[PDB]
Every structure is written in structure tokens, then in C-alpha cells.
Design a binder for this molecule. Sequence first.
Ligand SMILES: Nc1ccn([C@@H]2O[C@H](COP(=O)(O)O)[C@@H](O)[C@H]2O)c(=O)n1
Ligand SMILES: Nc1ccn([C@@H]2O[C@H](COP(=O)(O)O)[C@@H](O)[C@H]2O)c(=O)n1
Lengths: 229, 225
Amino acid sequence: HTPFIVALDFPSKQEVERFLRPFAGTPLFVKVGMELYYQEGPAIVAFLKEQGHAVFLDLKLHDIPNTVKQAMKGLARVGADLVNVHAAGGRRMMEAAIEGLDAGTPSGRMRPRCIAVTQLTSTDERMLHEELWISRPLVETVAHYAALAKESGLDGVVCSANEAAFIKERCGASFLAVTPGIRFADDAARVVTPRKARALGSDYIVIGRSLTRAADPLRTYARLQHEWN
Amino acid sequence: TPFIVALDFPSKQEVERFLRPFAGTPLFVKVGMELYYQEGPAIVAFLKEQGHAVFLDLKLHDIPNTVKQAMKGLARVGADLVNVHAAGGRRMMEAAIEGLDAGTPSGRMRPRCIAVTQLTSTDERMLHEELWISRPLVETVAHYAALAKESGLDGVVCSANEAAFIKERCGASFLAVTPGIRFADRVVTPRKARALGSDYIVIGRSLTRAADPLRTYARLQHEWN
Ligand SMILES: Nc1ccn([C@@H]2O[C@H](COP(=O)(O)O)[C@@H](O)[C@H]2O)c(=O)n1
Ligand SMILES: Nc1ccn([C@@H]2O[C@H](COP(=O)(O)O)[C@@H](O)[C@H]2O)c(=O)n1
């Protein structure tokens, strides 16, 4: 429906309501991270859906297969539209994740989309080699992980706009590229512009403070659309 | 108590039913993803109100700052123990510690925090062929445990077999929380687990699904000597 995903990086419903007030009537595609979901629970999701928003539950499930499977059934029942997991959890876990989603989804209905985190954006090549003990290049490791997720039946991954192109060449154009780290050309304090993100292949872009901290949220949301188009 | 009871139930209703017999017995219980994602922080407050210690097993694995704000949140919900994936890196694990601190009142210690080195369901094939980790599983587990040790965490989740080896690497006081526990009738035996060096043993269906939970808990204590 929309390429923009708004990250609700707040610790409570109250702050969430404050941000969304001006967006009344303009259904959004919002991302609920750990901070928010662990302090508000499934209640926050029912709330966002009542308002007519699409919800991306960014909890990055990474546990044993069965546990993930059971957790996904619940996440599908709560009403999530998109969820993710760590490819590092293995192919078996990722397949289980899909099994849980279908299990928690009514017949004749589409299960929530499920994408995989390959390597976190905060993970540099050094950390990859010295801490994680993965001797292979960061770029190829990402490509490998994406392929694994693709092999598991997942719909895509979380990647930088700069990784979208090669990930799609290896996994196919339909393989979703959900990319965070978005900033307008004139802000911030590892980043790309909405237009540039689109040119690179991103299907969805996660926007946070560039919108949640704007003086004029509505005009800024419009700017997002204009640049992207 | 060295026993941690895995509350692997669908909702609060099943949890209440199971705990009733234990009214006169403080327990150290584990709340995983399935239950927590279904009940929310409310399940924690409840358990605490019943005089139980709580291990919120969510295995957080995300960027540093997100894990920090998340832990600030888990400390305020009342959790006594939490965990993270060592795969997240030293910075992330250190941030978890910061989060717990900023989330703790002052009249008490920050909730403790342990790291998952490699999931108990990860074998060497998965590790090498899928995760691309070019080193033995056993050596990789010690490495990850060391990363957690160096990050300032209190311990790790590991099999009772890796317990001794991990402590030799990170210190005898470095905690060893061990899952996969089963009665004679993975390879477990509560007593065997204790002989291997486990500090806490996570017991699951072997107890929660037993015909007589309370009595199975008494047997757990006995085999533990
Ligand atoms: N260093 C960072 C900071 C934020 N992010 C992601 O993008 C979102 C926040 O973006 P700004 O608001 O982009 O901070 C978060 O919800 C997070 O998942 C990331 O991937 N790497
Ligand atoms: N293969 C397995 C089976 C159980 N477990 C852990 O122990 C608990 C279940 O214990 P039984 O039901 O003790 O297996 C779960 O909460 C889980 O975290 C594990 O880590 N790997």
C-alpha cells in the first residue's frame, strides 16, 4: 500500500498517541520495536490497528525453532502485518517461523509477511570477524544469509539501500528489501535519502526521528512522498 | 534455588492453574516469548505478586541503542533475570547493562543479565554451513561466553557439558544456566547436571506437564544432592 514505515521508537502508548494525533484519518504503516512492545504488550498492536494502521512488529525473533513457531502463531493472531527474525537462527528456525504464521492465520487469508535480519546495521566487518568469528566478507555473509532466508520461504530481509540491488540479484526481484537508516538531505547528527533509497532498489524504507522529531510532521510526511515519487 | 521452571503455557489462565499447588513455595520461573508476547509486562507483575522470581527469557538481539531502551523497559517491569544473544556484539551487551541500570529504581540491584552463546538447537553443521562460523562449535561457545564475560554480563545459557569449560574460561562464579533437563525415565539427570557444574537448571514439561507437579518438584530436589 505504502513504501514508508514509521518507527514508533517510544516507551509508551501515551507518547505514541501524541505523535499520531495529527495523522488522524491518514492510515500509516508503523513499526513497533522492542522498546514499545515490551512495555505496552499486545495491547499497543490492537490499538494501532483500531486506528486503521498497518503494523510491523520488529521483535527480531531469534530462539529455538518450536519457540519461534509458537510465538509467530500468536503474532499472527494479534494482527501483525509484518514481522522479522534473525537469519542467524538457522534455516530450520526460519521455516518454523513461517509455519507458526500460517498456523495463526485464518483459512482464505494471507499470513503476515516475514523478513529476515541478516547482519545488523550496527555490525561492521571488524565485529563480524573478531567478535562473531565469521571469517567471510560482510557483504557475502549478508548475501548468504539472505539466500538462506529465501530458501526458508521468507519474503525478504532488512538491508541497507546499498545492499538491496545485490540481494535481489541473488534472491530475485520479488525478494523484499526493507531498509532503515533514512534521513533527508538536510538533517541528522550509513544514511541515505528517500529518493536515493528508491533508486537503489529498496521496497520499503524505515523512517524514524526524521519524522517523529519534525516541527511539521504532516508537511514532512508529504515531503517524504514527493521525494520518493 | 537452582531450579528455574519454564512456564511454557499459552496464557495467564494456564499459568495460574499450574502455580496454585505451589502457593506455599517461592519459585524462580521463566517467561518466554510465547507467554510474554501474549500477556505483556502484566504477566511479570502478577508472578512477582505471587512471590516468585522471574527470568524474562526474550533473548534480545538488536542494535545497541534499541536493546538499551528495551532493557530500561524490562528493568521497570520487575524482571529479576534477563538475557541477550552474544551474537549481538560487545557494544550491544554493554548497552543492555546500561539500560537495566537506567531502568532500576535505586533500592535494588539491576536485574541480572546473561547471554545466549549458541542456541541449544544449533549443531556444528548449522553453525558452519549456515552461519558461516569457521571454528569448532565448542570453541565458538567459549569465545561467545568470553565476549559476554568481557561485556560485563553475569553469565550464559549453556548445556551442562559446557559448564565447566565455560567457567574455566570466564571464571567459576560466571553463571551457567542450563536447559534441556530430563529425568532418567538432551542427556540430563538433575544430579548429573549439578555434577557438571550447572548453577541453575531450567526444567520444562518434565514438570509442567507431570501428572503431579508438586510431587515432581519434590523429586527434583531429592535427585539434587
Ligand atoms: N544506528 C541505527 C539507528 C536506527 N536503526 C533502525 O531505524 C529506526 C530508527 O531510525 P531514525 O529514526 O532512522 O533513528 C529504528 O526503528 C531502527 O530499527 C538502524 O538500523 N541503525
Ligand atoms: N531443544 C530445546 C528444548 C528446550 N529448551 C529450553 O527449556 C525450556 C523447555 O524445557 P523441557 O520442556 O525442559 O525441554 C524452554 O523454555 C527452552 O528455552 C532449549 O533451549 N532447547
